[PDB]
């Protein structure tokens, strides 16, 4: 019900904020105009708006809605790269979509947060959002993303081993973070997985998946570009959102609300798997 004494300052609290950053470095390292400029419109015009509408509809608290919108403002993740390949989309084009969305995040995420924060806080809006801490993280995470691109081009041979090394490092670190943060916060987790938070964590990826497809069909796209744009919109950077919420924000204001990105990651992965199965069964039995 409460938070542990000296929350966000113990060595066990400072280590967890370091493993998250050491995680995100490889997550954003393993990732390396109508169809491409449409994904940006569907990602920064539909996902942040959905995150702001859902919080108002579900009557979420101010801090929970701010965390929801922060999660809906982060760029697309690397899961869409595999999802588009699994749904006969375009892996090569979905990779440049995600890289371009990540690069546009540095200038669009603070701008969208500033615009949509006025819909949550009316008079007590000052110092609610740490813009300096958000932009520092956003400009620091652009370094692994760029070295990932220049590494594959300069030394393609080693990249096959580096990608496997990163994929095996992130898998164990994910458990090491899910366990460490849970031990750190104690019994305050039941605040980040309330029924309303779980419903917002499940209805958001589905809404993104559907609305990206609908918009891409509205813009008269091909069946491959449409199917990769939808899942590039639906999938987001849960690790980068969690790292931002755990680092830039003060621990006393957010508390256990940085655990929502993982509950969003599991729901987006489950719904992507279900959509892939549905599509493949539809194609096989057509």
């Amino acid at each position, epitope marked *: 019900f*409460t938070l542990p004494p000296n929350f966000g300052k113990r060595p066990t609290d400072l280590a967890l904020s370091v493993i998250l950053v050491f995680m995100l470095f490889f997550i954003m390292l393993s990732l390396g105009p109508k169809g491409l400029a449409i994904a940006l419109v569907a990602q920064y015009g539909i996902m942040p708006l959905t995150a702001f509408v859902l919080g108002k509809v579900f009557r979420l608290k*101010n801090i929970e809605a701010l965390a929801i919108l922060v999660c809906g403002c982060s760029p697309g993740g690397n899961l869409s790269n595999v999802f588009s390949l699994a749904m006969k989309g375009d892996m090569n084009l979905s990779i440049v979509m995600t890289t371009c969305s990540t690069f546009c995040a540095l200038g669009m995420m603070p701008l969208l947060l500033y615009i949509y924060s006025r819909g949550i806080y009316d008079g007590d809006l000052k110092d609610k959002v740490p813009y300096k801490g958000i932009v520092i993280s956003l400009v620091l995470v652009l370094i692994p993303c760029t070295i990932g691109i220049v590494l594959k081009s300069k030394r393609p041979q080693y990249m096959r081993y580096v990608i496997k090394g990163g994929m095996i490092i992130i898998l164990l670190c994910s458990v090491a973070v899910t366990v460490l943060s849970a031990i750190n916060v104690g019994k305050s987790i039941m*605040f980040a997985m309330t029924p309303l938070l779980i419903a917002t964590s499940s209805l958001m990826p589905f809404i993104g998946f559907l609305l990206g497809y609908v918009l891409s069909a509205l813009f008269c796209l091909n069946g491959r570009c449409r199917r990769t744009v939808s899942m590039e919109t639906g999938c987001q950077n849960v690790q980068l959102c969690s790292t931002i919420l755990n680092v830039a924000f*003060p621990p*006393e204001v957010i508390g256990p609300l940085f655990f929502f990105p993982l509950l969003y990651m599991i729901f987006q992965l489950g719904e992507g798997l279900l959509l892939i199965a549905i599509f493949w069964c539809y194609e096989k039995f057509k």
Partner: nanobody, 127 residues
Framework: QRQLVESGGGLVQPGGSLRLSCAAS????????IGWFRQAPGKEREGVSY????????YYADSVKGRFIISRDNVKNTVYLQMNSLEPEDTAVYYC????????????????????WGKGTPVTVSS
């Protein structure tokens, strides 16, 4: 400054009482821990009364315990501080802080880091 406005300060005689206010600019004191401070010429700012406003936890300084009572008005977005039995050494400028704590106090302690601060209202207690 612009988020919190203090009022009620005035000149009172030793033995009288007065009540201050901490009306919020435009918001509610729900996810906040209000706290009244005071700073007299020669000494530094010290707390006199806090409030959790989520569970009712109250802190009272040992120099105002039994005399000062802090309260809240949910229907007016104000926080009061009833100051009874004022003494000559009680004259100072009384400020009011408000720290955004949606989850309450961190365990049991009253924190005020990154809190909105008012401009303060002077209180002169003399004959």
């Amino acid at each position: 400054q612009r988020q919190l406005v203090e009022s009620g300060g005035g000149l009172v005689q030793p033995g009288g009482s007065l009540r201050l206010s901490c009306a919020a600019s435009r918001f509610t004191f729900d996810d906040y821990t209000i706290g009244w401070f005071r700073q007299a010429p020669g000494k530094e700012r010290e707390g006199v009364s806090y409030m959790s406003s989520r569970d009712g936890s109250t802190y009272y300084a040992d120099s105002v315990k039994g005399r000062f009572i802090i309260s809240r008005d949910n229907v007016k977005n104000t926080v009061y501080l009833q100051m009874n039995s004022l003494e000559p050494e009680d004259t100072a400028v009384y400020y009011c802080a408000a720290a955004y704590r949606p989850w309450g106090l961190i365990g049991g302690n009253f924190d005020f880091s990154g809190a909105y601060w008012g401009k303060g209202t002077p209180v002169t207690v003399s004959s």
